[PDB]
Design a protein around this ligand. Structure first.
Ligand SMILES: [Ca+2]
Ligand SMILES: [Cl-]
Lengths: 131, 137, 44
């Protein structure tokens, strides 16, 4: 199914047709979009599906998730080999992260490094995450 | 079999050339007290087409009994949207849920269901689920 | 002069929280369909 519609449906946790609060931000981030803090500031108290749909259409018209995520990774591609280290990413997720169990983070790493290399080819990974 | 002569007559009253559409199979199966899904209709269509004679209708009916139906799984389905787990969902919640997930209701189906079954804004989804499993046979 | 990891972390956390949502909702979806089938039965 389409990503935006599905993200709304997934992050509307009580099924009342409306995302509110941090969930809103999470729904946005779950599409690969990092809202600048002023955008987060300006988010309404709640969004129904038409509101979320409009917000995401307008955002995505100017913001491209996969290349932005790729640039975020290439910040930490120290070797510059199109590849960041899985260990760094794991313990940074464990350190700064707020939502996933440690088991979840390990599952994620096994996804990103499907060959036991300790290196994450982050382009391939981001493309895998964006259907 | 459940009232064999009257099932036969209802099928034939809708039948043209001894066959009825799978949509009429759905309605007839409901009147008999079965609860086929649209997935059942699709699966049956892709082996037997869109027109059933009386025998293939009987086979359809026989495969739509859904023995996995039970109260706890139905209730857990709704309780998924209940953050309090107190056992209540609002009419807004029931409507958006039922018209968004699974095989979504049309607004007309939901409005008819709500007119008959939703007495309040705070719906006990456990009792509503029990009600829905009643008369099934 | 390393940069900060919070944006990447935030986005991946949200993504995988959504994947966990999609999977538990997958567990629940067949019985929502069952509910809807019984609803339509009561509605003839
Ligand atoms: Ca909500
Ligand atoms: Cl944050």
């Amino acid at each position: 199914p389409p990503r935006v519609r599905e993200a709304f449906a997934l992050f509307d946790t009580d099924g009342d047709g409306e995302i509110s609060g941090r969930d809103l931000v999470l729904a946005i981030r779950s599409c690969g979009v990092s809202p600048t803090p002023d955008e987060i500031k300006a988010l309404p108290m709640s969004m129904a599906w038409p509101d979320f749909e409009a917000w995401m259409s307008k955002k995505l018209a100017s913001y491209n998730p996969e290349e932005e995520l790729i640039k975020s990774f290439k910040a930490f591609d120290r070797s510059n080999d199109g590849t960041v280290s899985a260990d760094e990413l794991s313990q940074v997720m464990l350190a700064l992260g707020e939502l996933l169990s440690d088991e979840e983070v390990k599952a994620m790493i096994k996804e990103a490094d499907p060959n036991g290399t300790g290196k994450i080819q982050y382009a391939n990974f981001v493309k895998m995450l964006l259907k | 079999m459940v009232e064999a002569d009257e099932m036969y007559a209802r099928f034939n009253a809708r039948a043209s050339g001894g066959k009825v559409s799978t949509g009429d199979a759905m309605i007839l199966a409901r009147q008999l007290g079965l609860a086929p899904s649209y997935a059942d209709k699709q699966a049956f269509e892709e082996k037997s087409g869109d027109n059933l004679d009386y025998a293939s209708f009987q086979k359809f009916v026989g495969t739509s009994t859904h023995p996995e139906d039970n109260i706890e799984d139905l209730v857990e389905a709704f309780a998924y949207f209940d953050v309090s787990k107190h056992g209540y969902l609002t009419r807004k919640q029931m409507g958006n849920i039922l018209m968004t997930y699974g095989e979504p209701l049309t607004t007309e189906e939901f409005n008819a269901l709500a007119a008959e079954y939703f007495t309040s804004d705070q719906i006990d989804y456990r009792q509503f689920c029990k009600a829905m499993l009643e008369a099934e046979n | 002069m390393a940069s900060s990891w919070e944006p990447l972390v935030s986005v991946l956390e949200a993504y995988y929280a959504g994947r966990r949502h999609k999977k538990q909702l997958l567990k629940k979806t067949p019985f929502i369909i069952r509910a809807q089938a019984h609803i339509r039965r009561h509605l003839v």
